């Protein structure tokens, strides 16, 4: 546990990419930049409005960083949706990412949650006030079924953040806690269902494939992020309650065994993704295919995950995995490494002061 | 379907009951009757009101049977809460059950779900109109955190019923579908959180134990019901899409292997329940202890699960399992076998016509 399991990590990462067939796509760099800028621009203007600037307590620099990371996530993974959809989704997922900065006990503001909701009064918690006011801009892109999924997952996410304020990784022997919490904060159904705008897909005609994608993508999605984040989190003494770390505490196993568990679930989830959707509606496999690749690309190109540090270490090694990794990484960079100055401007703060 | 694994059913059921050392002593015959009648009486008066009689489309006989089954469930398992709490919970879980066996398509009534919610307008779907109007009577018994859990779980349940209308057990190879659906319709967080009225428990002082109980009780609860109720759902059309049966379809394994999977999860969940809460706050272990026993007692007695039939077929067999099964089944009846005429009166229909 002293050193980072670099060789084990590379092997699992290469397997993950091969299982999902990571490969070049029709999604260019020019289109990338266009979408990045469109999504960023609309979002930046939104978060710069006085109402938002005042009810959303976030350090300007992090809001800027969080927005940029989210626009990147949406644009790179929701490759098939319209520019407006990427923009509105970027706003919503930026709201979720930001809420992780509040130490404010939701308790006082949640005392009248239901009565206020039923009466049509603005929620006491400012996050809810902005999120629910903006939600319709996100929901207009989806049918009733998918919309319900986005709504539920966001409600779950809120409770997840609440629970996480206690920095609790679960009582030893509480085996069901880890994944219980991970689903709470994962946004699985929100992500999964938001992949099907009614503009491109008929919710009723594809009810079964969509429901199935939500169910399978929920886990793939969160576990992939748990793994790709495993490098940056490794020595992060601040980050104390990740799925992997709660496995250690709750299941009473080594950090290493927790990481074995995570990669097995991840690889298996990847296989089944392919096995189930390969022969289904081609348009559905396309969206699923593009999300998995873009999602990994995003993790690979975003400084946040510092995976470039791993590339800079096996860059010249002559091992099988090390080379497959470096090639995948270069492919990723080839289309995903983009300078912020090419799309993320002007800064939110500059629009807020204007 | 074809032929019920009666033999194997006996073995699995005996293993669970034995492992959890099934024994109910939550109430003296007299307290059982008092609570049953109190809960039934308030609920019956509620469902007999003209508004309820009009928006709730349910065959009168079915409403009557469902109400009686639920009052029994609540009273027998929520042994530590007040009479009012049992009554209000009985009303809520009766609403869910009436939908649980229903056959309706939500799409047209869910098109304006969010906008109506945000504006404070009554929901288009009549079930939501009655449930949300009544909810405050249930929520007043809990703190904000637990309340949030009840609200979310009910929202999940609705989507679960929606999904089940398609009679889909999952695509072969979609291993994550089964439990995905089971949590949707399980009411796990609703049940788990509703075990802690603020009248008896401080939500903030026991935040960790309550959150943990919600996480562990979610699975224990649903799996126990899946095992105990495998019989009544086996041939029912509306219940052909269940956890055990979706395991067969989705994982491509024998009905028998699905059963072995279910009992292992159940036994293990039982083991960890004890391991984690034995030494924790005694009042918490008491509620957890009382729910598990009362819940099982309820299953061996309520009409809905028809476990009497399985008894009237093995009460002779010299199979050891059929013997251990009948000893348990008679033990349950001795404590919880109560004639409806001692509490469930007058009938809802008679109050409706008055
Ligand atoms: Mg159900
Ligand atoms: Mg049912
Ligand atoms: Mg059942």
């Amino acid at each position: 546990m002293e050193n980072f399991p670099t060789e084990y990590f590379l092997n699992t990462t290469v397997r993950l990419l091969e299982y999902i067939r990571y490969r070049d796509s029709n999604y260019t760099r020019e289109e990338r930049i266009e979408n990045l800028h469109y999504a960023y621009n609309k979002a930046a203007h939104h978060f710069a409005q006085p109402r938002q600037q005042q009810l959303l307590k976030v350090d300007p620099k992090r809001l800027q960083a969080s927005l940029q990371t989210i626009v990147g996530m949406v644009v790179y993974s929701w490759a098939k949706v319209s520019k407006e959809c990427m923009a509105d989704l970027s706003i919503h997922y930026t709201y979720t990412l930001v809420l992780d900065d509040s130490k404010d006990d939701p308790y006082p503001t949640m005392v009248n949650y239901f009565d206020d909701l039923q009466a049509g009064r603005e929620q006491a918690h400012p996050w809810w006030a902005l999120v629910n006011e903006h939600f319709p801009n996100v929901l207009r892109h989806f049918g009733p079924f998918c919309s319900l999924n986005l709504i539920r997952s966001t409600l779950d996410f809120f409770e997840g953040c609440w629970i996480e304020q206690y920095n609790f990784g679960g009582f030893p022997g509480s085996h069901d806690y880890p994944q219980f919490l991970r689903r709470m904060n994962g946004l699985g159904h929100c992500v999964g269902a938001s992949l099907w705008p009614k503009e491109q897909f008929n919710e009723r005609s594809l009810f079964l494939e969509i429901t199935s994608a939500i169910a399978q993508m929920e886990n793939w999605m969160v576990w992939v992020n748990d793994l790709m984040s495993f490098y940056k989190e490794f020595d992060d003494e601040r980050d104390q309650i990740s799925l992997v770390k709660n496995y250690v505490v709750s299941d009473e196993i080594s950090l290493h065994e927790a990481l074995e568990k995570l990669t097995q679930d991840t690889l298996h989830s990847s296989k089944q993704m392919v096995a189930v959707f390969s022969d289904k509606d081609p348009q559905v496999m396309d969206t699923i295919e593009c999300f998995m690749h873009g999602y990994v690309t995003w993790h690979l190109c975003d400084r946040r995950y510092r995976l470039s540090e791993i590339y800079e270490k096996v860059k010249e090694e002559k091992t099988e995995d090390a080379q497959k990794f470096c090639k995948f990484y270069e492919q990723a960079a080839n289309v995903g490494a983009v300078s912020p100055s090419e799309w993320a401007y002007p800064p939110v703060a500059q629009l807020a002061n204007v």
Side-chain angles (χ1 to χ4, degrees), chain A residues 193-212:
Chain A
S194 67
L195 290 169
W196 321 101
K198 64 180 179 178
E199 209 182 81
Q200 292 94 56
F201 303 84
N202 190 309
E203 201 171 67
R204 298 158 125 175
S205 314
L206 301 170
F207 190 87
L208 303 183
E209 14 286 297
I210 293 181
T211 295
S212 298

Side-chain angles (χ1 to χ4, degrees), chain A residues 197-244:
Chain A
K198 64 180 179 178
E199 209 182 81
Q200 292 94 56
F201 303 84
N202 190 309
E203 201 171 67
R204 298 158 125 175
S205 314
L206 301 170
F207 190 87
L208 303 183
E209 14 286 297
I210 293 181
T211 295
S212 298
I214 294 182
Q216 286 178 62
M217 181 70 70
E218 163 167 44
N219 296 336
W220 190 82
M221 199 284 323
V222 298
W223 293 334
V224 164
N225 175 254
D226 278 314
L227 179 74
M228 303 287 237
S229 297
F230 185 74
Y231 175 64
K232 78 176 193 61
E233 290 176 23
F234 197 71
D235 270 313
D236 190 344
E237 300 190 319
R238 282 187 54 122
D239 177 59
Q240 287 156 43
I241 51 168
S242 62
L243 175 62
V244 164

Side-chain angles (χ1 to χ4, degrees), chain A residues 72-304:
Chain A
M73 182 193 65
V74 175
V75 172
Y76 285 29
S77 314
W78 275 255
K80 297 308 182 204
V81 308
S82 72
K83 291 186 197 296
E84 276 289 292
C85 192
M86 304 187 166
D88 299 328
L89 283 177
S90 287
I91 291 174
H92 193 73
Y93 290 122
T94 288
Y95 271 127
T96 48
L97 184 52
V98 164
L99 184 60
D100 287 319
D101 295 13
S102 192
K103 260 194 61 169
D104 295 348
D105 176 27
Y107 192 108
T109 43
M110 292 294 282
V111 174
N112 295 300
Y113 178 75
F114 191 87
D115 294 319
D116 282 332
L117 189 62
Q118 182 80 356
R121 298 190 288 272
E122 187 178 80
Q123 285 300 315
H125 195 301
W127 190 77
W128 270 132
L130 296 181
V131 169
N132 290 349
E133 171 186 50
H134 173 270
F135 232 152
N137 276 201
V138 174
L139 300 182
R140 66 181 174 173
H141 299 294
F142 308 86
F145 181 67
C146 282
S147 290
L148 175 59
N149 281 271
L150 274 85
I151 298 175
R152 294 192 309 105
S153 197
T154 302
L155 192 58
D156 297 346
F157 181 71
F158 187 84
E159 186 177 310
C161 288
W162 190 340
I163 295 182
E164 298 184 311
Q165 290 200 350
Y166 288 68
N167 218 60
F168 180 62
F171 294 130
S174 188
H175 307 342
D176 286 335
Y177 180 75
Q179 293 184 1
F180 155 82
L181 180 58
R182 186 45 172 160
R183 291 183 211 108
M184 274 273 179
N185 66 44
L187 282 168
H189 297 191
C190 191
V191 165
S194 67
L195 290 169
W196 321 101
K198 64 180 179 178
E199 209 182 81
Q200 292 94 56
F201 303 84
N202 190 309
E203 201 171 67
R204 298 158 125 175
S205 314
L206 301 170
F207 190 87
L208 303 183
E209 14 286 297
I210 293 181
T211 295
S212 298
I214 294 182
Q216 286 178 62
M217 181 70 70
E218 163 167 44
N219 296 336
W220 190 82
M221 199 284 323
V222 298
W223 293 334
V224 164
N225 175 254
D226 278 314
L227 179 74
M228 303 287 237
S229 297
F230 185 74
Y231 175 64
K232 78 176 193 61
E233 290 176 23
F234 197 71
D235 270 313
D236 190 344
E237 300 190 319
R238 282 187 54 122
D239 177 59
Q240 287 156 43
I241 51 168
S242 62
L243 175 62
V244 164
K245 293 186 176 86
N246 303 331
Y247 273 149
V248 173
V249 178
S250 287
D251 299 353
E252 313 178 82
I253 57 182
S254 71
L255 176 66
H256 180 79
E257 298 174 304
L259 176 68
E260 271 172 48
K261 184 178 176 56
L262 173 66
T263 77
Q264 279 174 53
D265 289 329
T266 299
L267 300 182
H268 187 195
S269 175
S270 302
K271 272 196 193 180
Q272 301 319 101
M273 259 293 166
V274 171
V276 175
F277 297 103
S278 322
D279 60 345
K280 261 70 177 179
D281 180 297
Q283 204 199 336
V284 169
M285 178 61 172
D286 197 40
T287 288
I288 289 176
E289 190 83 318
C290 281
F291 176 80
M292 296 193 266
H293 294 167
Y295 197 54
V296 170
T297 297
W298 177 59
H299 284 263
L300 288 171
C301 294
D302 202 295
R303 298 291 121 181
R304 180 173 268 62

Side-chain angles (χ1 to χ4, degrees), chain A residues 7 10 314 317-327:
Chain A
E7 194 55 62
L10 288 177
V314 306
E317 305 200 315
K318 310 286 185 170
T319 310
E320 196 191 332
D321 298 304
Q323 309 190 314
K324 277 191 189 156
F325 180 67
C326 294
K327 285 189 296 184

Side-chain angles (χ1 to χ4, degrees), chain A residues 16-59:
Chain A
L16 169 59
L17 291 199
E18 295 190 317
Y19 281 42
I20 61 173
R21 315 177 205 159
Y22 190 65
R23 64 183 198 272
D24 307 337
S25 83
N26 54 46
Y27 203 13
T28 69
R29 202 169 183 287
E30 291 69 48
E31 310 175 292
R32 226 91 154 174
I33 289 183
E34 279 171 48
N35 296 338
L36 286 172
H37 183 67
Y38 189 85
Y40 177 79
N41 182 69
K42 188 181 182 179
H45 275 80
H46 173 267
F47 287 111
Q49 305 166 80
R51 150 167 262 245
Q52 310 293 323
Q53 276 283 301
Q54 142 192 12
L55 305 200
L56 195 65
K57 306 302 176 182
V58 210
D59 170 56

